[PDB]
Amino acid sequence: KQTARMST
Amino acid sequence: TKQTARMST
Amino acid sequence: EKIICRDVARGYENVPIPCVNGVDGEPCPEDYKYISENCETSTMNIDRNITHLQHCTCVDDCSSSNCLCGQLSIRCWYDKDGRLLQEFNKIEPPLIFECNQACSCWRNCKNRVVQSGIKVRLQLYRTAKMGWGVRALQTIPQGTFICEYVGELISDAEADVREDDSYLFDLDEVYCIDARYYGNISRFINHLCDPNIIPVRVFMLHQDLRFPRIAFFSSRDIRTGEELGFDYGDRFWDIKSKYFTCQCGSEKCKHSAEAIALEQSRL
Amino acid sequence: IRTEKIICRDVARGYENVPIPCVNGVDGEPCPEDYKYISENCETSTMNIDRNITHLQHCTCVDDCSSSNCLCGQLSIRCWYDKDGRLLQEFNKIEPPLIFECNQACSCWRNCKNRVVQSGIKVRLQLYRTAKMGWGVRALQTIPQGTFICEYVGELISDAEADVREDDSYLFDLDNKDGEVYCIDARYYGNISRFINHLCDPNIIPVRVFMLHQDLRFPRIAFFSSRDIRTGEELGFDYGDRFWDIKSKYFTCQCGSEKCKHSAEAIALEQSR
Ligand SMILES: C[S@@+](CC[C@H](N)C(=O)[O-])C[C@H]1O[C@@H](n2cnc3c(N)ncnc32)[C@H](O)[C@@H]1O
Ligand SMILES: C[S@@+](CC[C@H](N)C(=O)[O-])C[C@H]1O[C@@H](n2cnc3c(N)ncnc32)[C@H](O)[C@@H]1O
Ligand SMILES: [Zn+2]
Ligand SMILES: [Zn+2]
Ligand SMILES: [Zn+2]
Ligand SMILES: [Zn+2]
Ligand SMILES: [Zn+2]
Ligand SMILES: [Zn+2]
Ligand SMILES: [Zn+2]
Ligand SMILES: [Zn+2]
Numbered sequence: 139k140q141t142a143r144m145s146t
Numbered sequence: 147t148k149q150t151a152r153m154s155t
Numbered sequence: 156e157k158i159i160c161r162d163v164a165r166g167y168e169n170v171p172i173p174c175v176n177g178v179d180g181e182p183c184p185e186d187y188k189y190i191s192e193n194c195e196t197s198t199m200n201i202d203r204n205i206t207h208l209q210h211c212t213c214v215d216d217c218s219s220s221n222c223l224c225g226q227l228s229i230r231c232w233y234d235k236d237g238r239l240l241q242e243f244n245k246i247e248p249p250l251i252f253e254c255n256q257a258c259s260c261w262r263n264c265k266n267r268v269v270q271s272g273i274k275v276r277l278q279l280y281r282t283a284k285m286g287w288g289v290r291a292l293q294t295i296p297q298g299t300f301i302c303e304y305v306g307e308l309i310s311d312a313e314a315d316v317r318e319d320d321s322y323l324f325d326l327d328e329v330y331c332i333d334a335r336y337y338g339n340i341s342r343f344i345n346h347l348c349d350p351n352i353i354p355v356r357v358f359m360l361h362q363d364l365r366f367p368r369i370a371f372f373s374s375r376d377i378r379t380g381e382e383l384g385f386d387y388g389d390r391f392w393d394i395k396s397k398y399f400t401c402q403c404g405s406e407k408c409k410h411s412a413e414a415i416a417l418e419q420s421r422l
Numbered sequence: 423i424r425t426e427k428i429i430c431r432d433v434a435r436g437y438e439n440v441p442i443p444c445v446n447g448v449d450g451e452p453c454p455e456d457y458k459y460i461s462e463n464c465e466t467s468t469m470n471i472d473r474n475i476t477h478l479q480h481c482t483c484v485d486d487c488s489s490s491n492c493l494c495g496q497l498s499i500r501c502w503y504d505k506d507g508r509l510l511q512e513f514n515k516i517e518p519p520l521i522f523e524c525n526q527a528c529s530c531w532r533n534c535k536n537r538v539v540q541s542g543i544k545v546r547l548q549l550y551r552t553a554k555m556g557w558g559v560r561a562l563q564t565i566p567q568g569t570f571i572c573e574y575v576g577e578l579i580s581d582a583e584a585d586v587r588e589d590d591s592y593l594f595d596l597d598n599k600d601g602e603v604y605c606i607d608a609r610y611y612g613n614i615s616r617f618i619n620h621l622c623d624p625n626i627i628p629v630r631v632f633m634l635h636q637d638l639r640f641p642r643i644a645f646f647s648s649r650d651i652r653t654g655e656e657l658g659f660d661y662g663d664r665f666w667d668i669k670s671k672y673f674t675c676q677c678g679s680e681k682c683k684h685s686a687e688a689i690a691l692e693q694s695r
Contacts, residue, residue, distance in 0.1 A: 139668075
C-alpha cells in the first residue's frame, strides 16, 4: 500500500 | 389526512 | 398492590422503571422489545457526517447567549438545573439543538439535558380505564425532562399500512416513530385532555432534520403518584374516535363519547 | 530540573467514564490540540453501515449470559470474558477471534457478562510526554492480564481514501484483505488510543469487536492487556509490518527493548545479513 497502516 | 392515526408535537 | 417487574427497561435506562398492577390480573406487558434508543428496520441513512453538525466554540459551560447551539433555537431554553424556562412556548415548541460531539464544550455543559437521559423515578402501572399507564414516584418541577418517545423509525408510506396505529408518532414526506414492536417506557404514556407533559423536537448527535428526537417535559409541577400524560392531538383522535373514545375523565375532555355526540349536535 | 506539569485535567472533556489527564515533565510542548477528541467513531462521508435491528444475531438468554447456550458467546466459539470482564487466560493472543457482544436485540439485561467493551473505559490512564516518542499513554494503576483498556476510535474511511491521506501516523486497517475494506484514521478525530506508541515488547493487543451492529466491514478495535501491567508502565502495541515497511524510511523505533525489531541497529544488521 501507499500509506502506513497499523493492523492486527 | 392519513390512513393511520398519528401522535404529534 | 403487587410489584410485578423490577425494571421493564432491563437496565437500559439510567434508573430502573418498575411495573405494578393493583387493578386487575393483567400480567406485565411483553408483546414488544424494550429499546432505549431509536432503531431502524430499513435503509434510512441518517446523516451522521460529523462535518454537517452545527457546533459551538464555547470554552465555558454554554450558559452564555453567545453559544451558537443555543442561538439555533433563538436561545437555550434550559435553566441552570436542566429545566425549560418558565417562558418556553408550550403550545408551539421550538426545535432544540443540544450540544454535540463537534462542539468545543465539555460533556457536562448546560445544553445537554435530553442526551443525558432519564433522571426521574417513573412507574409503569395499571390504570382503571385506559390500560397501562405511566406515573411519577416523586415530585417533578415544571420543565423537567421526563423521557424520550423511542421506537422504530419508519417512512410515511410504511406508517400508512401499519395494522396497529396506537403507537405512531409523526416527526414533523414526514417520517414516524412506531413504538408498537420496539419502544421504551414512553409507549405507555396515555392521552390526557388535561396534560402535564409536552413533546419537544430535539437534535443531539446528528442534525438530520427528517429525524428529530421526541423529548417529553413536564408542562407544570407534578405531584408524586400523578399519571403522566400528553395531548396526542387531532391527527390521532380524528382517526381513532371511530374505534374508541377518551376515558381521561376530565371535565375539559374534548374526546369522550359525550363531547363528540354534543359536537355532532352542530345545527 | 524540569517539573512535571499537569497541562490538561481531561483530554476527553468529560466524554469518558473517567478523566484522562495530560502531563509533561520532559519539554515545553503544550497539550496537543491539533485534533478533535471523540469518544466514538465518526463518519465524514456516507458509510451505509448496516444498522437494521432485525439483521442482528442475538441471544435468547434469561441468565446473565454466562451459560454455553448464549448464541452471542457461540458466535466466537465461546464468551471469552470471565465474571470480572477479563479475557480468559486461554484467549488466543496471537490470532484473536471476533468478539460478538450482546446488543439491543438480545433478551438479556444491560449488565449481562457479555458487554465489556460497550461499557467503556474503566482503568485510569494518563497522557504524558515521553523522552523519545512524543506523547504516549501510561497506566496510573495495576492492570491484570485480559482487561479492556480502550478502543481505537477515529474517522472511518475507505481503503482508497486511506491511500491518499497525507499524514499516515494514525491509520488502523480494519481488515487485512483486498477489496471493500475500511480504515480508522485518528489523525483529525480520535480518542486517547491515538497516543498509544508502538512497542516491540507490547503489553496490549487489538481485538475486533461487534456491539450495536454486526456489519462485518466495520469491526471496532478494542485493546486488552496481554499481561499484567504495572503502575506507571507505558502502554503499547505492535503496529505491525504494514506500518514499519513504510515508516522505517522516515524514523526508526525508539522503544529501547532488547527484543526491538525496528531500531536503526536491528534494521542495519538485517540489511547486512
Ligand atoms: C400509546 S398507547 C398507550 C399505552 C396503552 N394504554 C397500553 O396499555 O399499552 C395508546 C393507546 O392507549 C389507549 N389510550 C391512551 N389514552 C387513552 C385515553 N385518553 N382514552 C382511552 N384510551 C386511551 C388506547 O388504546 C390508545 O390507542
Ligand atoms: C499513533 S501515533 C502515537 C502518538 C505520538 N507519539 C504522538 O506524539 O502523537 C504514532 C506515531 O508516534 C511515533 N511513534 C510511535 N511509536 C514509536 C516508536 N516505537 N518509535 C518511534 N516513534 C514512535 C511515530 O511518529 C508514529 O508515526
Ligand atoms: Zn456552547
Ligand atoms: Zn455546550
Ligand atoms: Zn454546542
Ligand atoms: Zn379526555
Ligand atoms: Zn446471552
Ligand atoms: Zn447478554
Ligand atoms: Zn446476546
Ligand atoms: Zn522497538
